[PDB]
Design an enzyme around this catalytic site. Structure first.
Site, PDB file in Angstrom:
ATOM      1  CB  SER A  62      -4.710  -5.722   0.135  1.00 36.08           C
ATOM      2  OG  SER A  62      -5.649  -4.889   0.795  1.00 36.08           O
TER       3      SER A  62
ATOM      4  CG  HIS B 278      -2.009  -1.056   1.149  1.00 41.04           C
ATOM      5  ND1 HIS B 278      -3.079  -1.036   0.281  1.00 41.04           N
ATOM      6  CD2 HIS B 278      -2.139  -2.190   1.879  1.00 41.04           C
ATOM      7  CE1 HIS B 278      -3.823  -2.110   0.475  1.00 41.04           C
ATOM      8  NE2 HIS B 278      -3.274  -2.828   1.439  1.00 41.04           N
TER       9      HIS B 278
ATOM     10  CG  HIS C  66      -3.526   1.392  -4.137  1.00 36.43           C
ATOM     11  ND1 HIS C  66      -3.592   2.461  -3.270  1.00 36.43           N
ATOM     12  CD2 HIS C  66      -3.144   0.327  -3.392  1.00 36.43           C
ATOM     13  CE1 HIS C  66      -3.276   2.059  -2.052  1.00 36.43           C
ATOM     14  NE2 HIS C  66      -3.001   0.768  -2.099  1.00 36.43           N
TER      15      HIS C  66
END
EC number: 3.4.21.97
Lengths: 194, 194
Positions: free
Chosen positions: A114, A46, A128
């Site tokens: 994820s 992330h 994203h």
């Protein structure tokens, strides 16, 4: 160290970003953000600075939102190799080529993804897709392959309509990214991973 | 913590223990130790105390020595769950059942295996098969499944003769292990893994 390869080994990633109940993501809100207004990047853990690829296509499916992505990053390949050298190598057999070594490493070290969404309060809901380091984050299982069709093939549960829309949407999206690589930085990737 | 489940979820593991050159393991020395004199146990990270299963069958194949194993360990399932709880859970979808949660965890956390042999100086050359923790050791890729045939199916490169001998040898070997579990210890497994 050894010199960086001039061309990145193209890696295709496929899988379900989420699965529907037989409650955060229901089929109705997914269709509201069905075609992303902006292209969804692919990053590691992330962190926006560690962008290594681009989501090629996201298709709605009765099972859930299914995606296909392209990863083109020499530095990610080098960093994963550095992590592999930090472990006892006990594989018995001839050395794998550059492509299957990368597949061997990214599948074991980055086994899940994820999906990131904007905060709760067509649409910009999708943000994203993050490659999840094993032992750090646990997301949805994906497949990695050196071919576009090959990455989608193991998902037999996908409806043939969603599969067709995925590979046609991915093919035209892959074309817009002609000859594009990602360079987040070797040290940037090492800090996030190792 | 929560109470240990009374019955272990049977897990079948399959893969190539080694691959032949198109030099440590050549086809000639493999056939010399082709039928193991004693059953090869399955342990974690080569530690004999952490025995979690048993190799059901080892068959010679033109690609290389191919094996099938059975893992029956409630404590391994519990320890892997404890490792999963130590990571950010970002999987989007309904909760997986007990069986697919275990498959999800053991495939990501123990993705490869390593074959142990006796020192260089039918035969007793084969010693045990070790489940390799990712980030610690890198061995040959295996598949985990809740079915015997299902564990062997993804290996399309195996010759049909080796596949047949494997599932018939594994079926009769699985029968001798009727109702056998493995209890290395929850703390024993935690120390090795985490």
């Amino acid at each position: 160290e050894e010199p960086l390869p001039d061309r990145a080994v193209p890696i295709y990633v496929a899988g379900f970003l989420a699965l529907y109940d037989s409650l955060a993501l229901d089929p109705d809100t997914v269709r509201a953000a069905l075609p992303p207004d902006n292209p969804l990047p692919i990053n590691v853990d992330h962190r926006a600075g560690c962008e290594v690829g681009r989501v090629l296509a996201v298709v709605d499916d009765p099972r859930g939102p299914f995606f296909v992505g392209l990863i083109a990053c020499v530095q990610l390949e080098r960093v994963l190799e550095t992590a592999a050298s930090a472990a006892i190598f006990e594989r018995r057999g001839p050395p794998l080529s550059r492509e299957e070594r990368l597949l061997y490493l990214i599948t074991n070290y980055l086994p899940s993804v994820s999906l990131a969404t904007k905060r709760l309060g067509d649409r910009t809901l999708f943000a994203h897709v993050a490659l999840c380091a094993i032992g750090r984050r646990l997301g949805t299982i994906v497949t990695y392959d050196t071919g576009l069709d090959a990455a989608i093939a193991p998902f037999r549960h996908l409806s043939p309509a969603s599969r067709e829309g995925a590979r046609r949407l991915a093919a035209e999206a892959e074309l817009a990214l002609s000859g594009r690589t990602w360079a987040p930085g070797v040290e940037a990737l090492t800090h996030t991973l190792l």
